[PDB]
Design a protein around this nucleic acid. Structure first.
Lengths: 49, 50, 50, 150, 49, 100
RNA sequence: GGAGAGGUA
DNA sequence: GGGTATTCGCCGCGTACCTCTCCTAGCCCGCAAGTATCCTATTCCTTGCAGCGGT
DNA sequence: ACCGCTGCAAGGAATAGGATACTTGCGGGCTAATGGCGGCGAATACCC
């Protein structure tokens, strides 16, 4: 019987913080990576398939 | 789309709750409660008594 | 009354048996006349012939 | 007959019950149902050494049928296991239904998968939609559209 | 409780009294109905019954 | 760019450690893991060294998202076996670096 | 908004 | 093959009004996983002193 | 005689156990029909 009811919630909001991190992502710019043909190809060579 | 135009023309008919199938664009035209027989059936009227 | 057969012994023996007044159901009572008072209304079941 | 079909193939059976309080009883309930299978018990709430014993002895084929909770969902090896029997597929999330269907297989052997249902009108309507979705799609590449069913 | 309350509440037989007499009570407590569960149908009975 | 790997169990981390180490068998990259199976004395050097950063590839459970791990230059998040992790654990790493 | 019981004509 | 009688299930089942009663559904807590800390206690590992060896 | 080696006291150390708080799923409890006729397609089986 000791499984009745009455636990509350919403001790901490999420929505503002999710909007914050999403805005922070959409504000700054991501990193433009650099690609090497033959260096990546030697890594492809390590793939035995 | 085949459920939209006429749900239940297939053997499988998608529903909502309590296993009653949804009304489709057939169902407001199909049968004894559609838009076809309702004007032909009895419509209650104003200015009347009993 | 619950009977528990003890597993170690052969088929049909008694480990222990318990008993308590379990409650199940609220059956309506007929009044002194014939009426079953169901929801403040006063219903009567008619005898069916089948 | 599912258990027999698997054991006279020679592999092992994942039989999953997913309730630890009665898995001990369900073990013998299966065991005198199939007297020639070898049944051991494994679940996540043991003392964290017998579990590894059970899984390694399973890995060394010392017994055939393993009664288990969804601990097997962590995706272990041993492809000799080739048959999932979910006893009560009523209450199980559809994504991990697909995941458990991924557990058997891993072989050129044709794996099998029986999803036991309760009586159809007893169950939730949502469970029926889930089971119709999983009975519709049995292919490779069907994992994603099954998530569109989720 | 659900099974007995469904029958006593909502059946073809547990019906509402006519109480506007003593006669109508005492002859609604002796009605021999041939309808309801396990019986024949209002619209689907011949001239013989 | 200090690749960070996240999985939601110890076992998947354990296969991933083998996969990463065996595939990166010829390049100057140091790859490690962390979980509850690692001792604290190993944790206290691995996570500290993450700030120093010769480990470039790091694998683990939620232990990464324990508000103490400080990547010196995070450039890649890879997360495996998605349908776990709530939302908070999913974006708690991106909270460290907005344009990761 | 539906199903069921009645009752009148 | 192919005309042809034949039966069987699936689905239609026939005015107007009045009275009264029955109707289901979302969610909190439980279950199973899984993961993290946190003490605790509890054994385990490692070290340092007590005491005999001897040739 | 005195370090050299050993056996035991201890102390810390590490680790199981059993708490707590977090995620996924999902359900369970719980408040909030066997008294009928007709048409027609299906499905015949039936004789050709």
């Amino acid at each position: 019987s000791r499984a009745r009811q009455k636990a509350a919630e919403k001790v901490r909001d999420v929505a503002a913080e999710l909007l914050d991190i999403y805005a922070q992502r959409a504000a700054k710019e991501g990193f433009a990576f650099k690609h090497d043909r033959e260096q990546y190809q030697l890594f492809c060579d390590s793939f035995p398939f | 789309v085949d459920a939209l135009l006429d749900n239940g023309r297939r053997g499988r008919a998608i529903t909502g709750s309590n296993k009653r199938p949804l009304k489709s664009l057939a169902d407001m035209i199909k049968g004894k409660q559609g838009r076809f027989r309702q004007n032909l059936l009895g419509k209650r009227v104003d200015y009347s008594g009993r | 009354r619950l009977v528990i057969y003890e597993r170690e012994a052969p088929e049909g023996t008694v480990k222990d048996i318990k008993e308590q007044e379990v409650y199940m159901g609220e059956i309506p009572l007929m009044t002194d006349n014939g009426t079953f008072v169901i929801n403040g209304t006063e219903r009567v079941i008619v005898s069916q012939l089948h | 007959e599912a258990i027999l079909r698997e054991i006279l193939r020679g592999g092992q059976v994942y039989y999953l019950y997913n309730d630890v309080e009665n898995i001990q009883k369900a073990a013998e309930r299966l065991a005198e149902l199939v007297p020639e299978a070898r049944i051991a018990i494994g679940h996540g709430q043991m003392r964290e050494r017998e579990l590894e014993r059970v899984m390694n002895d399973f890995h060394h084929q010392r017994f055939n049928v393993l009664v288990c909770t969804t601990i097997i969902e962590t995706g272990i090896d041993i492809p000799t296991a080739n048959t999932i029997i979910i006893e009560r597929a009523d209450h199980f999330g559809l994504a991990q239904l697909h995941q458990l269907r991924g557990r058997v297989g891993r072989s050129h052997h044709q794996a099998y998968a029986w999803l036991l249902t309760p009586h159809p009108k007893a169950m939730t309507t949502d469970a029926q939609k889930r089971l119709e979705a999983i009975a519709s799609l049995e292919d490779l590449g069907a994992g994603f559209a099954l998530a569109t069913h989720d | 409780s659900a099974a007995v309350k469904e029958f006593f509440g909502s059946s073809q037989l547990s019906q509402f009294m006519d109480q506007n007499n003593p006669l109508s009570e005492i002859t609604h407590k002796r009605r021999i109905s041939a309808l309801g569960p396990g019986g024949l149908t209002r619209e689907r009975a011949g001239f013989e019954v | 760019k200090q690749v960070a790997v996240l999985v939601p169990t110890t076992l998947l981390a354990q296969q991933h450690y083998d996969n990463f180490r065996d595939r990166f068998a010829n390049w100057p990259v140091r790859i490690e893991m962390i979980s509850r199976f690692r001792s604290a004395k190993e944790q206290t050097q691995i996570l500290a060294e993450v700030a120093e950063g010769k480990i470039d590839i790091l694998i683990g459970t939620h232990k990464l998202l324990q508000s103490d791990v400080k990547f010196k230059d995070l450039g890649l998040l890879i997360v495996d076996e998605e349908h776990r992790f709530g939302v908070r654990h999913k974006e708690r790493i991106k909270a460290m670096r907005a344009n990761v």
